[PDB]
Design a protein around this ligand. Structure first.
Ligand SMILES: NC(=O)n1cc(NC(=O)N2C[C@@H](N)C[C@H]2C(=O)Nc2cccc(OC(F)(F)F)c2)c2ccccc21
Length: 216
């Protein structure tokens, strides 16, 4: 997260760090007791998911690390596109739930967010162009763009200096308390106004998300 601030500790209890070789790789959103929604290029080795965290390195009682029983890339995802860029990760067991660890509801109605609406994106992504990695969860509020400016399964938000960036991929874009977007995982210039943030619209994939939650 560029131009954001440190989030309040555990105030976003759905936030997951998707980790490889014990290091934060991507963001995730807890969408059910046993499932974390991230993006597809995060999977691309041994995948783990950290729930209940604010600090990636410090002790916190609500911190739990989980292995992954199954990883489910969207089937139309390809390694060179940002199309269909979602990944469902099934935790080794049900998340121990509580005030720090709790699923966020997700948009099932396929209707765009109103342009100009400020939405919240959070991550342990880089916080400047030198690649500084934050120990603690960051976030920022961002204005959703009209589709004509962004130029149907994608949405854009303002990238004027405030932005999602590397290591925020797979994280949440949340509007009026509901998950609307997942940070795409493709390389892009960050914090340039003429090059908006891109996010996958979960409402577009409502049938696939239910199907995967339903084969459990
Ligand atoms: N949505 C975005 O703007 N973006 C989404 C991107 N994709 C990723 O971040 N990916 C895809 C895959 N390799 C996985 C991920 C990744 O690179 N994670 C990563 C790599 C090194 C360190 C790291 O931790 C920290 F962020 F630096 F804290 C995270 C990305 C990369 C560069 C610039 C922008 C980017």
């Amino acid at each position: 997260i560029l131009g954001g601030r440190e989030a309040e500790a555990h105030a976003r209890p759905y936030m997951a760090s998707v980790q490889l070789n014990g290091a934060h790789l991507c963001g995730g959103v807890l969408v059910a007791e046993q499932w974390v929604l991230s993006a597809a290029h995060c999977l691309e080795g041994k995948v783990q998911v950290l729930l209940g965290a604010h600090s990636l390195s410090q002790p916190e009682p609500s911190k739990r690390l989980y292995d992954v029983l199954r990883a489910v890339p969207h089937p139309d995802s390809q390694p060179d596109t940002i199309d269909h860029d979602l990944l469902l990760l099934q935790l080794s067991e049900k998340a121990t739930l509580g005030p720090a660890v709790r699923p966020l509801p997700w948009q099932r109605v396929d209707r765009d967010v109103a342009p100009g609406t400020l939405c919240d994106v959070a991550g342990w992504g880089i916080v400047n162009h030198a690649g500084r990695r934050p120990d603690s969860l960051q976030h920022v509020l961002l204005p959703v763009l009209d589709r004509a400016t962004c130029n149907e399964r994608l949405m854009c938000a303002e990238s004027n200096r405030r932005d999602s960036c590397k290591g925020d991929s797979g994280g949440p874009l949340v509007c009026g308390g509901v998950l609307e977007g997942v940070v795409t995982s493709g390389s892009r210039v960050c914090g340039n106004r003429k090059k908006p943030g891109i996010y996958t619209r979960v409402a577009s994939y409502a049938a696939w998300i239910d199907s995967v939650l339903a084969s459990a």
